[PDB]
Structure 1
Amino acid sequence: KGSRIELGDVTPHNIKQLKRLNQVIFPVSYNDKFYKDVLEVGELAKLAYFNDIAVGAVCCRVDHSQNQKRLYIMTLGCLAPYRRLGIGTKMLNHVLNICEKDGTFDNIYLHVQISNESAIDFYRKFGFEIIETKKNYYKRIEPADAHVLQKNL
């Protein structure tokens, strides 16, 4: 009630804004296929607005691996000047809400570069655990290692 944060749908009209946000926020590039897939996942991809200004986004996919139905968060981020305003929480809660309303997901997971202490803190607050550390997950950036964070459902 009175929230300055709103999530909106990703469409062909604003996908360029999502691509721009990811470019600035993330140290790795996402190919044309990632953005094409994003347009087809429905509610699993959203843009976050702060006072109607696009400041972050979340892109997820359904994953069928380890004989499970898993939600894979590919990207979840917010521009640096708008951090610690609850934008990340609003995006994570949106995806946790989808998972709860669907009821067929075993878990939710993502990769977090080991140097991202603030992202590890953020996800651990939501009940995500470090279940593994993947050596050389990244190819062109340092550290190349990524923790796998998972929340069971």
Structure 2
Amino acid sequence: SKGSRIELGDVTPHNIKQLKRLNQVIFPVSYNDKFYKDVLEVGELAKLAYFNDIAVGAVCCRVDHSQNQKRLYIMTLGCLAPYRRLGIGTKMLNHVLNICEKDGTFDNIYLHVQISNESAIDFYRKFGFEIIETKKNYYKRIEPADAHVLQKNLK
């Protein structure tokens, strides 16, 4: 962490415009105004990521109670293409893993990855996420439509 050029910051009504902008470039699915209203309310579960004080990424999560578990759902975690492989993803994922660890009541953390997202699969598997399912036709508008469900067990 020391000397690091990467820093995470809070999402606020002041920089939320910048979050949406980042998400529009990085992620193939569009998020509605509800998404953005909700992110302003999850506190530490939404962050902007900065490299040399430039906003280049963001992570947005939600608490999920499904399958009789308490789950952390990563809805978006990503950064701008020219800044990849610099540790920014790791900083964002470690931020969320650290919250779950301090809280202690989460059963797992999971997310959906388009089957073509080789680099995302590589990234999450490095941290102990596993493909636990491939959902056919998960995505409505993009090709390919299928998504892997990646999950890391915490319990």
* Alignment TM-score, normalising by the size of structure 1: 1.00
Count of residues in Structure 1 that have an aligned counterpart in Structure 2 = 153
Q: Which runs of 4+ in 1 moved over 6 A?
A: none
Aligned counterparts of 2:74 and 2:107: Cα–Cα separation in 1: 14
Displacement after TM superposition at 1:25 (Å): 0.3
Q: CA RMSD in A?
A: 0.3
- The percentage of counterpart residues that share the same residue type is 100
Aligned counterparts of 2:115 and 2:52: Cα–Cα separation in 1: 32
Aligned counterparts of 1:119 and 1:125: Cα–Cα separation in 2: 10
**Cα shift readout 1:113-151 (whole Å, capped 9, x = no counterpart):** 000000000000000000000111000100000000000
Q: SS at 2:4's partner residue?
A: coil
**Cα shift readout 1:54-76 (whole Å, capped 9, x = no counterpart):** 00000000000000000000000
1:141 aligns with 2:137: no
Displacement after TM superposition at 1:109 (Å): 0.2
Aligned counterparts of 1:119 and 1:57: Cα–Cα separation in 2: 15
Aligned counterparts of 1:144 and 1:57: Cα–Cα separation in 2: 24
**Cα shift readout 1:76-126 (whole Å, capped 9, x = no counterpart):** 000000000000000000000000000000000000000000000000000
1:129 aligns with 2:103: no
Gaps of 5+ in 1: none
* Alignment TM-score, normalising by the size of structure 2: 0.98
Match of 1:50 in 2: 51
Aligned counterparts of 1:134 and 1:37: Cα–Cα separation in 2: 26
